[PDB]
Swiss-Prot record, chain A:
Family to which the UniProt record says this protein belongs: Belongs to the Integrator subunit 5 family.
Region of interest (Disordered), ranges: 72-94
Function: Component of the integrator complex, a multiprotein complex that terminates RNA polymerase II (Pol II) transcription in the promoter-proximal region of genes.
Whole-protein residues included: 190 to 471 of 1019
Higher taxonomy: Eukaryota, Metazoa, Chordata, Craniata, Vertebrata
Modified-residue entries (Phosphoserine), positions: S90
Name assigned to this protein: Integrator complex subunit 5
Compartments, as annotated in UniProt: Nucleus; Cytoplasm; Nucleus membrane
Assembly notes: Component of the Integrator complex, composed of core subunits INTS1, INTS2, INTS3, INTS4, INTS5, INTS6, INTS7, INTS8, INTS9/RC74, INTS10, INTS11/CPSF3L, INTS12, INTS13, INTS14 and INTS15. The core complex associates with protein phosphatase 2A subunits PPP2CA and PPP2R1A, to form the Integrator-PP2A (INTAC) complex.
Curated annotation (Swiss-Prot), chain B:
Domain remarks: The WFEF motif is required for the recruitment of protein phosphatase 2A (PP2A) to transcription pause-release checkpoint.
Entry's transmembrane regions: none
Naturally occurring in which organism (per UniProt): Homo sapiens
Disorder noted: Neurodevelopmental disorder with cerebellar hypoplasia and spasticity: An autosomal recessive neurodevelopmental disorder characterized by global developmental delay, profound intellectual disability, seizures, absent speech, spasticity, facial and limb dysmorphism, and subtle structural brain abnormalities including cerebellar hypoplasia.
Similarity annotation: Belongs to the Integrator subunit 8 family.
Protein name: Integrator complex subunit 8
Compartment(s): Nucleus; Chromosome
Domain of life: Eukaryota
Function: Component of the integrator complex, a multiprotein complex that terminates RNA polymerase II (Pol II) transcription in the promoter-proximal region of genes.
Subunit: Component of the Integrator complex, composed of core subunits INTS1, INTS2, INTS3, INTS4, INTS5, INTS6, INTS7, INTS8, INTS9/RC74, INTS10, INTS11/CPSF3L, INTS12, INTS13, INTS14 and INTS15. The core complex associates with protein phosphatase 2A subunits PPP2CA and PPP2R1A, to form the Integrator-PP2A (INTAC) complex.
Residues of the full protein shown: 499 to 581 of 995
Length: 282, 83
């Protein structure tokens, strides 16, 4: 039954035929009768592991979306966790197009949390495949630009709490930010009022030359960022660097160094960008 | 600040001073120092504002030595801007 349904869905997706409309309707009816979230999640996963990388489908896609919605109607924390794990395990072709197709608030939040955990693990392991999976998850979350500020705030709060894994969490966040364009630049600037800076300085004190290089790269990315409110960020940085308003002398020195580095980077992009090609927008 | 302990920012400051400079001799010194402490990479493409007529660009850049071509390119561009 399940094998036949998966075959019909794959055939519909590859060749746009109506021979799978009644089969999809019957499968949907059976799934609601079963009321098995795990069964629906497994059925959706079989239809996306290999039935989603061949060709785009409409009826099969709708059937898979309905099955996923039925699975997610109940709590199904374990099913969501195994479902998220199967998606990262099989990140083939439209893995994001399938996992992110839920378009539900709770499902999106769970997927964002799972992607953040996967990215943290990838950063800790320094593995290319894990980093690629984390980047794919971040990109999938970015396309669903519904609500990422709470997830970013939670990740930032978690990172400053630690000192050993704080550097790794910060590096992972900076790396995802370089591809996400720092959408919540204003939020990132605002949160670090008085104590986040001290916690981050303490955490980075356990860092090394790799931490310094990551900080320089993050400073460059931030300089090539902050479109919404750049004046606020610049004022916050200058007050803590020239005004000596930083809670830590090391923090103030780091702020001054970051300002100098950002100025140098802008000057490079500003002048040595090239006369032939058009300018790069800052 | 001088002596930044980093070659990249040192090069950035050096080329900034090169752009700011107006004396041909000091420009020569800065550019030859840059060529020495870098690879054989052309450095006339460090300030896009600098302009050179397309008619004379072929001849000005048709010099085998990167150092000499960059020196002459920067000298003529800066002097034309001054004019």
């Amino acid at each position: 039954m399940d094998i036949y349904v998966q075959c019909l869905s794959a055939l519909i997706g590859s060749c746009p035929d109506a021979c799978v409309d009644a089969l999809l309707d019957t499968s949907v009816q059976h799934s609601p009768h079963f009321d098995w979230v795990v069964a629906h999640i497994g059925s959706s996963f079989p239809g996306t592991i290999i039935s989603r990388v061949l060709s785009c489908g409409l009826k099969d896609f709708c059937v898979h979306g309905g099955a996923g919605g039925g699975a997610g109607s109940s709590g199904g924390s374990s099913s969501q966790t195994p479902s998220t794990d199967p998606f990262p395990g099989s990140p083939a072709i439209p893995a994001e197009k399938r996992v992110p197709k839920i378009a539900s608030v709770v499902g999106i939040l769970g997927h964002l949390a799972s992607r953040h955990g996967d990215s943290i693990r990838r950063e800790l392991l320094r593995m290319f495949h894990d980093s690629l999976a984390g980047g794919s998850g971040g990109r999938s979350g970015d396309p669903s630009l519904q609500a990422t500020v709470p997830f970013l705030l939670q990740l930032a709060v978690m990172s400053p709490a630690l000192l050993g894994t704080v550097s790794g969490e910060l590096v992972d966040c900076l790396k995802p930010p370089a591809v996400l364009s720092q959408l919540q630049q204003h939020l990132q600037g605002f949160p670090r009022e008085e104590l986040d800076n001290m916690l981050n300085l303490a955490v980075h004190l356990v860092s090394q030359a790799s931490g310094a290089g990551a900080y320089r790269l993050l400073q460059f990315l931030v300089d090539t960022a902050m479109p919404a409110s750049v004046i606020t960020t610049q004022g916050l940085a200058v007050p803590d660097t020239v005004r000596e308003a930083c809670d830590r002398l090391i923090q103030l020195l780091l702020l001054h160094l970051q300002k100098l580095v950002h100025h140098r980077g802008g000057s490079p992009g500003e002048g040595v960008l090239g006369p032939p090609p058009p300018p790069r927008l800052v | 600040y001088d002596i930044p302990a980093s070659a990249s920012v040192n090069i950035g400051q050096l080329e900034h001073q090169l752009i700011l400079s107006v004396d041909p001799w000091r420009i020569r010194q800065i550019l030859i120092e840059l060529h020495g402490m870098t690879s054989e990479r052309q450095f006339w493409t460090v300030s896009n504002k600098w302009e050179v007529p397309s008619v004379y660009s072929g001849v000005i850049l048709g010099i085998k030595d990167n150092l000499t071509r960059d020196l002459v390119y920067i000298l003529m561009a800066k002097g034309l801007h001054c004019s």
